[model samples]
Target: MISLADLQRRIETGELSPNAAIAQSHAAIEAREKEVHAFVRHDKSARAQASGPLRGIAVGIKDIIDTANMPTEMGSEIYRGWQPRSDAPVVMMLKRAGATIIGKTTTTAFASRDPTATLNPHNTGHSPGASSSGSAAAVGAGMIPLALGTQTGGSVIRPAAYCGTAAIKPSFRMLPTVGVKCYSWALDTVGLFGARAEDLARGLLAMTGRSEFSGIVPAKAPRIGVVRQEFAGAVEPAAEQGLQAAIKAAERAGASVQAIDLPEAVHEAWRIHPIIQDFEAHRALAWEFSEHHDEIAPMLRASLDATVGLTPKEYDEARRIGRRGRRELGEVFEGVDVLLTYSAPGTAPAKALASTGDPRYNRLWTLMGNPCVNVPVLKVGGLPIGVQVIARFGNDAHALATAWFLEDALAK
Candidate 1:
């Protein structure tokens, strides 16, 4: 994979021109995109500015995001040729930072559960988890150094885990959702996928212009909390092995680690995630569901159909439980710098297109609105599984820093 930091360093040292850096991405896409199917479409002639912190970066924007220069088909026939008049605020942020918008990567229809045709670069027979399928695969396959994805449930982290890329689902709303299609306004969060934790940090820093995301070297080993998420159900052995590896490596690197149990309120929040998500989705995609029902992807269509009876009373109560859970989560972090947990239940399902991997491991944190980073730790039988490092809400810097630390530790 192309390292975003390495590309910028080369450009800074005159070892590689900004245009040349972008050309490399174009060439990779040209060579592998046919096999990978990571992008819906791409522009080989896309150019990058020779200035700004992200000058040499090539980025893939998920198809669900607005991009005036390209069709945002949203991986659905309902809006087969839809094009927004302007870029999303997040897209403009990347442009202003001098990153080239290489193309729109495929998303599952409307960033919902329906899987896309995108192939996992590691092993084409295996699934690349969605709804951020292309964003993760594009970065994983070295087609680009950075890409934008959004997660309402496991969309960002799980896909990153399956694709073997570093990704961050920042504290909710850390990145604006203004021009992005909303699945669940409350749960949907804009995220980044890249080659490493530092790459994600650089990409996020450029987009948000947030100084905190820059130079994230931890002064000391972090106090780590490990949550196995029993409520999320049994993980595949690959996931168990990956988590154990992270714990051992972190301890070897001098970071203190311990197991912690989540509060009942937090577990309660997990149970209500679908309630909050589906209720908002019904409204978010009201027109499409109401007018273009047949065009809606089968899984999401069925989901909406089943939840049509979800009342405001159920939603309101779920919201109350969610708020309580978020508060309880904050208390959980008081003694630890970050929490380590599974990025997915397992690696991407082998040769399976019927379903994207489950989002059980990811839903609670997304609901809690905490910053989470996936650190690709190990692979089992040629498929990758990762453990996510999560920090208290708004401690995004710590989340990235600790994830970077763990990534480095595991490497050692």
Candidate 2:
């Protein structure tokens, strides 16, 4: 990995030019990307886009989002060259921030549960996870420092955790979804992956122009609450040990950590998640599929086929249940600052073309529309694992504070 301090010096000292970064990244890609399958499309014209603060910062854009002038393959043989003429608002935003648009990274078919050709940089035996699989694999396995991705389930957070890095799926709607494919509008969210939490913070601040982050993160220890129990032993022991270790480390570091039991509604959040996502997705993609089914991936195509069988009666009831669940979950956070949980059921699943592992840890947060942050602080033995911290909508500052403390705690 490139020395982060040196990279920052280059950014702050203006010695690291974006063009130079692209040149190096291209070289790295030539060596690493072929087998990694990290990208669906690598823009040779990316050099033309490398010219800002983010110029040197190459990004792996998830295929779900349109890249305007680049080939918009949504990770299946279906829409191979269906290029869009305009960028998704988020794509445009990243460009405006000066991130070198490296091109579309591979996503699972329709960003669904199926796997892709991409291999985790960590090992060939593991599945890179799904959806934003390439995005996390690229960043974690040392393909690049930053990337753009979206999550309808655990696509972003789960991958980040499995690969051992820091990631944030901001509060729903904090990032726009205008040009991204909708697996489930209710679950979809724009998120990012980066080498460190500070990099993640700086990237968001640079894009959002929040200046306080230029200084130190908050000085005080934040009130941290653990979701305590999840999915009835759905959590793997390694994940639980890693998360608990971080908690104890934070307490040792002088931060307050409490185990909080959430309501019964939290348990039902995951079951209701698919209800909203699949139903809303049916509507978002209805027009697209009527004309482009052959252009969509087989898995996504099949998902749409399944959705078509649903009665409006079911979708309507799902909406009602979603609304009630959101309210009930919000009550759980009324007094807590931020809630913590496993970013994944375990470390990166075996590298293969099979399943992307379970998303139970991430389903509830996506359903609740809360912001999530994942810090890959645990390297149990030589393998990496992820621990995620979540906060209520608009309580991102609190989440970051807790995450910063946890990132430091696990170091010892």
Candidate 3:
């Protein structure tokens, strides 16, 4: 995997130029985008002006967000060729950090539970967990080392896990929410992906300009609390074994590990999540659903149909329940710095082109709107398995630190 640090070194040594890196990334895209279906468009011209820590770096952006001169498809045929008038706020952040807007990546229609045409880079026939399918696959296949993604549910974490890549779904509102399609504005979050946690943290530092990472002892050892509950239900043996091994390795690395208990708030959050999601989706996509039912993808159509049936009273109740859960979980962070769990129930399912695998492993954090990550550093039966880390709300630094710890311990 091409890391930000390596790219930086190449630039520092005059062995690489931003323009040359851009050329190489586009070449990879041309060779691989067809079988992978990861990128929507490659802006070669942008590379000429690329310059900074990430200068010349190519990043695949999930199609849900607005891109200045590129078509933001939102993963639907209905919005084909819809050029955005302005860049999303996050796009501005990327450009400021010196990264080239390589191209738009594929996503599930409307970032819903529906799957996408994007296939896994590791194993083409199998699905790369959807929503952020294109972003993860493109990065994993060596087409790009970094990319942008979003997670209303498991969109960011699950795909990273399945595709064997590193990703951080930052605190729900830590990054600005403008310039993106909304499944639920309240739950949607900006996500980031890189091949390693250190690289991810470095990029985050460059973007945010606040790096109090001194406490993070660069591989000195790790301290993690391993927790599992109903949301991690019926996981495959391989996943559990992989997860346990990772936790144990961290412990062996001088980490003060503990068997933390799962919080009751997770159940409440999971229960309330669907209500809020459906309610928001009912309204968020109402205009489109109302005007072009025949044009939307089938899987999304079913979800829209189900959501439209809820009564106003039910929607209000769901909102109440959802906020209550978020507040309660936010309170659960009194002692825990970060929470660890499975990235998904198991390795990529044999075939999940219609609906993505279960998001049970990701709900509580998304509901809580905390900074979270999927560390893709292990394998089972040649399929990828990942461990997730969720930090207290607004603690992106801690979340990234913990992920760095896990990434090293889980290194195979």
Q: Which candidate is the best by TM-score?
A: 1
lDDT of each candidate versus the true structure: 0.92, 0.75, 0.79
Q: Which digits, one per residue and each the tens of the lDDT, describe model 1 over residues 171-279?
A: 9988899899999999999999999988888888888878898787742589999999898788999999999999999999999999999999999999999999999
Clashing residue pair totals per candidate (backbone < 3 A): 0, 6, 0
lDDT string for model 2 (1-412, tens) is 4323245558657787667877776776667887788888777667724454565777779998998778777776666778888999888877787777787888997788877878777776777777898888788767677788888888989888877877888888888888897778778898888877666766676566666345437325667788744554567777888887878887888777788887776666666777677777778877667877777766667777887777678777767776777788788787777787788888776654377878778877887888888987676545578788887886665566667767777675
Of 1 and 3, the candidate ahead on TM-score is 1
> Which 10 consecutive residues of model 1 have the lowest summed lDDT?
213-222
Displacement of the residue 394 alpha carbon in candidate 3, Å: 1.4
Candidate 3 stretches with Cα past 4 Å from truth are 48-50, 212-221
TM-score for model 1?
0.99
Off by over 4 Å in 1: none
Query: Per-residue lDDT tens digits of candidate 3, residues 1-412?
Result: 5686667678768898878888888888888888988876776665734566678678889999999889998999889988889999888887887888888998889987777878888887777887888888898888886888898888899888988888888877877879999898768888887887776776676566665532343434445667775555668786787688777777766776667765565576677777777788878888888898989898889877876777778867866776776777766566566777888877776554355778877866787788887887578778888888887777777888878777776663
Per-residue error (Å), model 2, residue 198: 1.1
Give the C-alpha miss distance for residue 278 in model 2, angstroms: 1.6
Residue 87 shift from truth in candidate 1, angstroms: 0.2
TM-score of each: 0.99, 0.91, 0.93
